[PDB]
């Protein structure tokens, strides 16, 4: 079968912080993106949908930075909250490298997805 995993630590004494209010919260966990339905090879010019979700998403309104790699760049905020798919159409065929960055007042999570788009060739 197939499965993923993660792991990273980040803690330091109270040296500095850009916050004027102490509120109870927790960092992001189990953050990753997925493509609508298991697809093998998509054709060029077909808008692709990216489904994002979280395991606990306890953290508050967090920021999200999606990197298409093909010059396209967008900055979404509270993606999980809005639970809205990310549409994106390609022009030329070729495996693309997608990534995401999440950093909230509590913690920060990141993920990377690989997309493949083959031309009109058989298959």
Curated annotation (Swiss-Prot):
Residues 34-117 form the PKD domain. Glycans are attached at residue 78. This is SorCS2 104 kDa chain. The lineage of its organism: Eukaryota, Metazoa, Chordata, Craniata, Vertebrata. The chain holds residues 760 to 869 of 1159 of the full protein.
